[PDB]
Amino acid sequence: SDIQMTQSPSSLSASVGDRVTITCRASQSVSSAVAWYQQKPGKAPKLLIYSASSLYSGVPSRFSGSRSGTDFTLTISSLQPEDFATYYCQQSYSYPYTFGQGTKVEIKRTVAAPSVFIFPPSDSQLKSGTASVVCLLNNFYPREAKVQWKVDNALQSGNSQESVTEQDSKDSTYSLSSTLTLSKADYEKHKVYACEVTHQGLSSPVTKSFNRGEC
């Protein structure tokens, strides 16, 4: 039957300079044929290790791996901001060549507050009969945050969606984008459009608002 590679932990967070160990266990004997890959978000995986211990050309010295029995370990000696990625093992012993489910490595850094911006709908969009209002939370940490829309003090729920970027591989920060969508009709029936941001680097919540028909 098919060989299973059980990789742990599912995810981990560790600071710069730390040693990190990701482990992988084969459900059967893979006899040392194991590779490790690094995958940056939206990008092709890159080969790190190819036998259980061997370093592929061009791969930094901080990456190593070793085998005892069916247990396999990948080791990053000093974590770098560029090391943010998902890390996968794979066995080449017997087809199908199975991957472990992966380990996403977040890099800890010092707390940073989101810079908040708010964007009123374009005139162009309005004539389509829709209004989109975008609240931008730029370059913050940790990833948890909260955005709340208020239209004339009425809290908006179920009409927005948000999206977060992957951890930056230099400053290790995050960025968030939230969009409130309304019919034009409902848009032009109100005045104050605001977004309130809750995060740790903020001693008190920040609000960024506009008034419809203002400039």
């Binding site: 998902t86 080449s92 992966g102 964007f119």
Partner: protein
């Protein structure tokens, strides 16, 4: 100079069929073991199939077995993945990769996949191709100012956005697209710039949605509030 390039991805209806191409340069496919690996949205990697063109040996993962076969064309130095009876779960990015066929690959363990393609997205859906609209996000914090494009109501993925034809890179964030209740995608691309530069420098959103052949250059500038002129 060794490279692999995927082609043939795109929108396909359930039960339909698709043919992906993996085109090799800087080596002959006969010298390598060519694999296909796929990743469903927010999912791990899944090994699906491989061909070794010299022998002609192949294997298929159960998930794709009997619906998918792989073929080698040495004349075009390309491998093809023929996918039939496609299902919604077959929706994923599809990578071709290789390992070189070396003494070590055979007698020893060097099988790790050294060269990968960039990937190609395969969306299995009944829904219809639709192009985006592009709307400005106009700047009005500190010594910096933020502006961007809102790329709204398109399908399927992907959409690519660059700034000033790719001249402007630092400062940029393009956010993961979101699926709305309509069934269409929306994303925003934002750039923070020195507020000093709003007069001087031009900012242009370059939007490309390949499925619908829609390309848009959107110039973003702060809005002007007079009205007395």
């Amino acid at each position: 100079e060794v490279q692999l390039v995927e082609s043939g991805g795109g929108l396909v209806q359930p039960g339909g069929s698709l043919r992906l191409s993996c085109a090799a340069s800087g080596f002959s496919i006969s010298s390598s073991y060519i694999h296909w690996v796929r990743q469903a949205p927010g999912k791990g990697l899944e090994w699906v199939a491989y061909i070794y063109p010299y022998y002609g040996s192949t294997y298929y993962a159960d998930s794709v077995k009997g619906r998918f076969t792989i073929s080698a064309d040495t004349s075009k130095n390309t491998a093809y993945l023929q996918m039939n009876s496609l299902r919604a779960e077959d929706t994923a990015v599809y990578y071709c990769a290789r390992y070189y066929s070396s003494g070590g690959s055979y007698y020893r363990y060097s099988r790790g996949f050294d060269y990968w393609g960039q990937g190609t997205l395969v969306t299995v859906s009944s829904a219809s191709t639709k192009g985006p609209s592009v709307f400005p996000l106009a700047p009005s914090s500190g010594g910096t100012a933020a502006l961007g494009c809102l790329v709204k109501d398109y399908f399927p993925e992907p959409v690519t956005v660059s700034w000033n034809s790719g001249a402007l890179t630092s400062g940029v964030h393009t956010f993961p697209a979101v699926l709305q209740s309509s069934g269409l995608y929306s994303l925003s691309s934002v750039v923070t710039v020195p507020s000093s530069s709003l007069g001087t420098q031009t900012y242009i959103c370059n939007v490309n949605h390949k499925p619908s052949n829609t390309k848009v250059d959107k110039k973003v500038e702060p809005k002007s509030c007079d009205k007395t002129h």
